[PDB]
Amino acid sequence: AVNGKGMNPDYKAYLMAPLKKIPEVTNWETFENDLRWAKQNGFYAITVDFWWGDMEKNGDQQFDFSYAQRFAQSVKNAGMKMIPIISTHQCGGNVGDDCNVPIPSWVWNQKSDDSLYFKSETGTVNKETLNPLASDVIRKEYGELYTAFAAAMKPYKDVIAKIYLSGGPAGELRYPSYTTSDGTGYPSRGKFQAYTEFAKSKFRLWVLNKYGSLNEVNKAWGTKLISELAILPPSDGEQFLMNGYLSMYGKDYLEWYQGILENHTKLIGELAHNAFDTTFQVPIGAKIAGVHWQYNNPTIPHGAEKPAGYNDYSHLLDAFKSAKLDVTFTCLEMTDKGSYPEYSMPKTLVQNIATLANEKGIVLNGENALSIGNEEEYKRVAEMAFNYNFAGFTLLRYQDVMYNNSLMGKFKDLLGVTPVMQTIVVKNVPTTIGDTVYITGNRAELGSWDTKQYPIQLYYDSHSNDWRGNVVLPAERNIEFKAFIKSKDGTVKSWQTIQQSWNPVPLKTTSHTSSW
Ligand SMILES: OC[C@H]1O[C@H](O[C@H]2[C@H](O)[C@@H](O)[C@@H](O)O[C@@H]2CO)[C@H](O)[C@@H](O)[C@@H]1O
Ligand SMILES: OC[C@H]1O[C@H](O[C@H]2[C@H](O)[C@@H](O)[C@@H](O)O[C@@H]2CO)[C@H](O)[C@@H](O)[C@@H]1O
Ligand SMILES: OC[C@H]1O[C@H](O[C@H]2[C@H](O)[C@@H](O)[C@@H](O)O[C@@H]2CO)[C@H](O)[C@@H](O)[C@@H]1O
Ligand SMILES: OC[C@H]1O[C@H](O[C@H]2[C@H](O)[C@@H](O)[C@@H](O)O[C@@H]2CO)[C@H](O)[C@@H](O)[C@@H]1O
Ligand SMILES: OC[C@H]1O[C@H](O[C@H]2[C@H](O)[C@@H](O)[C@@H](O)O[C@@H]2CO)[C@H](O)[C@@H](O)[C@@H]1O
Ligand SMILES: OC[C@H]1O[C@H](O[C@H]2[C@H](O)[C@@H](O)[C@H](O)O[C@@H]2CO)[C@H](O)[C@@H](O)[C@@H]1O
Ligand SMILES: OC[C@H]1O[C@@H](O)[C@H](O)[C@@H](O)[C@@H]1O
Ligand SMILES: [Ca+2]
């Protein structure tokens, strides 16, 4: 892995459930059999959207958790685990969706202003999820929903492994800046989503809190605004992304705009820990999208990420750490391209997010963004998962492997693996002063032979005069590997003469000893 590490010993594979309710796909008894088959193929748990539109449909505090209870009882019957997602966003309208579950329609009547929804630069209204500016309504409604779900689901504590929150559209902490109705779908630039009158008022009040008075705002921004009502979000989003972002105004607007998501993360994490920690005592997570298009457009740099709310990932991740939420990044299977017109850099983006998460001590999980039809994309996922310290990978979605036995077996081989520590010992190594010793090998868990970025460090044992490492490996998979030496300057000096192998890596911890 990176940094001379190996794969995360906590790694688990998860399967996403269908977006529709199980009886719309298969009967409960077959579903139980399906869960046993997923378990045999290395899946630890099923993730499942429990839609707000299903659970509080008819009015405020009119709850119905019966579908989630029935689902959990079939998970229990199958000897499986589940990860509920408390899906306070709409099903329908985002990539891959095959469902139609708006959030409950009565929520929109809780305010007579425009505080609850989003409006884009060009006036497109989005009602996929509550606007995180409406923190009073979110505190009330999410707190009530999380508390009632916990009470209804307490009998199923034994099968709940983790709970996910929904921070925004498609279950991701973001603004709805890429949508067909707004003309901002992939691979286009995004539009900022802060043009309700309420969002304009909140930015204005934030700016006047920061600086005190309009006279100090103008000194800070180098502007000549005549009245406070001229404090506004960008009137020309394209120009803002071309060059306005560099100004003091631009840094303040992006700080505020991303800051709404950071504060929302704080709030939903407080609400979730209060609702769930005593009842369930499980990890709680939230998701960030991989907005990989327009990454390196030279004219509008990061022109889809910034409107989505992603201006500074380090600061965004710090909010997850503070809120005690684990992070899932949802686009792992793709390759960098970087070419006109999409300017798409998804692998660079997950490497950067993973590096930051690992730096900050945030448990990091991954998903694939689009359905996978080919083993090559599983190999891509494995490269990321097993070299960048991912604790989990969730496969979108159920039917793609449940009804494709060939592809299921490729998943089991490459990603449905159980980590096991093994001690690797290499004898008679001709190191000199300054040399370090590593292993590399064929599978992604061994860095796929990449000696530069991914090799696993061994350590001299002066009692035995050999080099040893306790390496986490995929149980019951075949591997080939070799030790090699790096000089002080980091260059590869020499290699173990003979290719080593384990056919397979044993299920239980032992050791593999070889000579150089
Ligand atoms: O400070 C002068 C001017 O700045 C901004 O104008 C932008 C404009 O929005 C873009 O369409 C393009 O014309 O670039 C301008 C910057 O040179 C403000 O939006 C505007 O109010 C202000 O007058
Ligand atoms: O809120 C002040 C001013 O902000 C916007 O103008 C920005 C523009 O968006 C930036 O790209 C850059 O050019 O700086 C401008 C401020 O000097 C709004 O477009 C404008 O209406 C508003 O008055
Ligand atoms: O938020 C939903 C989904 O959006 C992005 O998915 C892209 C996908 O990566 C592209 O290849 C193409 O299909 O457009 C989609 C957006 O409509 C994110 O990459 C993904 O993380 C996120 O879940
Ligand atoms: O069932 C979870 C989640 O799936 C979809 O959103 C995905 C998006 O399609 C993928 O790119 C992905 O791996 O990231 C998002 C979050 O998992 C649905 O659109 C969403 O409603 C649903 O909650
Ligand atoms: O690069 C892939 C290649 O890596 C290893 O080959 C080493 C070989 O072991 C060394 O003795 C020397 O020849 O350098 C090679 C890399 O340039 C693996 O042994 C080999 O299986 C794998 O294809
Ligand atoms: O002998 C091969 C496997 O057969 C069954 O697996 C089924 C699984 O039960 C079902 O859910 C899935 O759709 O089809 C596979 C293959 O028919 C046994 O349950 C497995 O243990 C066997 O390995
Ligand atoms: O295959 C298992 C055995 O493989 C050999 O390559 C190693 O030298 C042994 O230490 C190991 O127990
Ligand atoms: Ca309520």
Side-chain angles (χ1 to χ4, degrees):
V2 298
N3 294 330
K5 308 185 82 280
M7 79 182 305
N8 193 321
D10 292 332
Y11 172 79
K12 301 293 191 301
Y14 309 122
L15 182 61
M16 297 191 182
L19 295 169
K20 283 187 182 184
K21 288 179 169 176
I22 292 301
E24 297 289 358
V25 181
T26 195
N27 70 55
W28 294 111
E29 251 177 42
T30 305
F31 172 67
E32 294 165 12
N33 204 62
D34 286 357
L35 288 182
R36 287 189 296 269
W37 178 233
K39 191 176 186 195
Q40 189 183 318
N41 281 280
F43 289 105
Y44 183 80
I46 185 164
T47 73
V48 56
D49 292 279
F50 289 137
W51 300 105
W52 194 9
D54 288 329
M55 296 186 295
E56 203 180 358
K57 180 187 271 197
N58 290 339
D60 185 25
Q61 304 300 94
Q62 298 185 39
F63 296 107
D64 183 353
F65 296 108
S66 60
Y67 173 73
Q69 293 170 323
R70 185 68 184 280
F71 182 106
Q73 179 71 48
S74 275
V75 170
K76 182 185 190 44
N77 294 343
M80 191 55 163
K81 300 292 183 49
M82 60 190 286
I83 298 174
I85 309 161
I86 313 306
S87 295
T88 44
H89 58 285
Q90 171 175 301
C91 204
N94 292 304
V95 62
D97 289 355
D98 173 24
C99 55
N100 176 16
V101 190
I103 74 171
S105 67
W106 56 264
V107 303
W108 304 113
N109 282 125
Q110 295 292 105
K111 289 288 182 163
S112 56
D113 64 10
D114 58 7
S115 66
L116 300 179
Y117 55 84
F118 307 84
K119 187 180 287 194
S120 81
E121 291 175 26
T122 59
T124 309
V125 166
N126 187 285
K127 280 171 159 186
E128 280 186 66
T129 189
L130 287 174
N131 189 317
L133 290 168
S135 54
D136 50 343
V137 176
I138 288 159
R139 173 174 291 279
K140 179 182 182 290
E141 300 303 332
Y142 291 23
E144 287 165 349
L145 177 65
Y146 293 175
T147 299
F149 179 88
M153 298 294 288
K154 178 171 182 178
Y156 312 102
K157 161 186 186 155
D158 290 358
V159 302
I160 291 165
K162 167 173 179 168
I163 296 164
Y164 270 117
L165 314 181
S166 171
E172 291 160 334
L173 180 78
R174 65 184 184 81
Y175 290 96
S177 58
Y178 49 95
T179 63
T180 298
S181 301
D182 207 17
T184 53
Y186 166 88
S188 293
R189 83 156 183 104
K191 286 168 180 173
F192 289 95
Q193 300 293 315
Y195 295 85
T196 50
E197 300 305 304
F198 191 70
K200 296 174 182 165
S201 175
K202 284 310 107 165
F203 175 58
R204 179 178 301 116
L205 291 168
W206 182 92
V207 169
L208 290 167
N209 174 257
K210 181 169 179 167
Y211 295 110
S213 64
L214 190 61
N215 293 342
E216 292 290 327
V217 174
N218 275 329
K219 178 249 105 203
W221 286 355
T223 49
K224 295 175 74 187
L225 308 178
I226 296 164
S227 88
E228 293 78 8
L229 288 176
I231 300 165
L232 292 163
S235 72
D236 179 347
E238 174 174 29
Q239 178 269 331
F240 181 82
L241 292 166
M242 286 175 64
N243 52 63
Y245 71 95
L246 291 160
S247 67
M248 191 69 239
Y249 165 79
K251 288 180 280 182
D252 276 346
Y253 170 75
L254 288 163
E255 177 181 349
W256 172 77
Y257 188 69
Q258 178 173 311
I260 300 309
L261 301 177
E262 292 165 346
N263 292 339
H264 184 62
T265 298
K266 177 169 190 195
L267 176 55
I268 67 180
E270 173 204 338
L271 299 171
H273 282 290
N274 174 256
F276 298 139
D277 282 358
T278 294
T279 296
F280 301 109
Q281 301 160 37
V282 294
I284 308 178
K287 305 185 178 182
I288 300 180
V291 182
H292 54 84
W293 57 102
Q294 302 311 334
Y295 186 100
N296 68 321
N297 185 306
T299 299
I300 51 159
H302 302 286
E305 288 158 277
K306 297 184 195 180
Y310 295 165
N311 185 59
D312 179 335
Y313 290 114
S314 177
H315 199 273
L316 186 70
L317 288 165
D318 288 341
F320 279 76
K321 182 80 165 176
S322 299
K324 296 183 185 297
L325 293 172
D326 298 345
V327 71
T328 296
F329 184 81
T330 63
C331 115
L332 258 60
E333 83 283 13
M334 307 179 66
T335 58
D336 279 345
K337 303 164 183 92
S339 54
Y340 170 89
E342 304 94 346
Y343 293 111
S344 169
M345 296 289 284
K347 183 178 183 172
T348 288
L349 173 66
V350 58
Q351 290 174 319
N352 181 208
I353 292 304
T355 297
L356 290 168
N358 295 329
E359 276 168 356
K360 291 170 194 294
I362 301 168
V363 175
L364 175 63
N365 306 276
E367 311 175 346
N368 56 303
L370 302 172
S371 276
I372 289 168
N374 187 286
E375 176 180 13
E376 189 61 26
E377 270 65 60
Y378 290 158
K379 291 180 178 197
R380 302 276 57 75
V381 169
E383 180 188 356
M384 280 311 315
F386 301 136
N387 292 283
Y388 285 84
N389 199 40
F390 281 79
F393 176 75
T394 303
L395 184 68
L396 182 159
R397 188 175 303 282
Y398 194 90
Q399 317 88 324
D400 296 341
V401 285
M402 199 61 60
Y403 300 159
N404 185 339
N405 294 346
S406 178
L407 206 50
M408 175 71 92
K410 290 173 186 206
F411 184 90
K412 182 183 182 177
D413 175 46
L414 292 166
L415 289 168
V417 290
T418 294
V420 58
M421 189 278 284
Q422 301 292 352
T423 301
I424 305 305
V425 178
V426 185
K427 296 224 179 248
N428 304 302
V429 189
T431 46
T432 63
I433 183 152
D435 290 350
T436 44
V437 179
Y438 295 75
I439 64 174
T440 182
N442 56 351
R443 281 192 63 106
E445 299 87 331
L446 294 156
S448 307
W449 298 116
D450 186 327
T451 60
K452 193 184 279 188
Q453 319 174 76
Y454 297 155
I456 305 164
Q457 193 162 14
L458 305 187
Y459 296 83
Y460 185 63
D461 178 339
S462 62
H463 309 24
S464 51
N465 187 41
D466 57 26
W467 290 78
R468 301 196 178 201
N470 275 17
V471 181
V472 179
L473 292 174
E476 300 183 306
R477 301 294 185 271
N478 297 333
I479 59 169
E480 292 193 351
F481 65 96
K482 278 194 172 184
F484 66 94
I485 292 169
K486 297 192 176 186
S487 307
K488 174 166 63 190
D489 64 8
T491 56
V492 175
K493 216 160 172 253
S494 61
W495 296 73
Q496 179 166 32
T497 303
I498 299 287
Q499 187 107 317
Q500 304 298 307
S501 57
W502 226 341
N503 295 133
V505 173
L507 190 64
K508 289 217 340 183
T509 294
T510 180
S511 61
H512 181 301
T513 306
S514 66
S515 191
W516 179 269

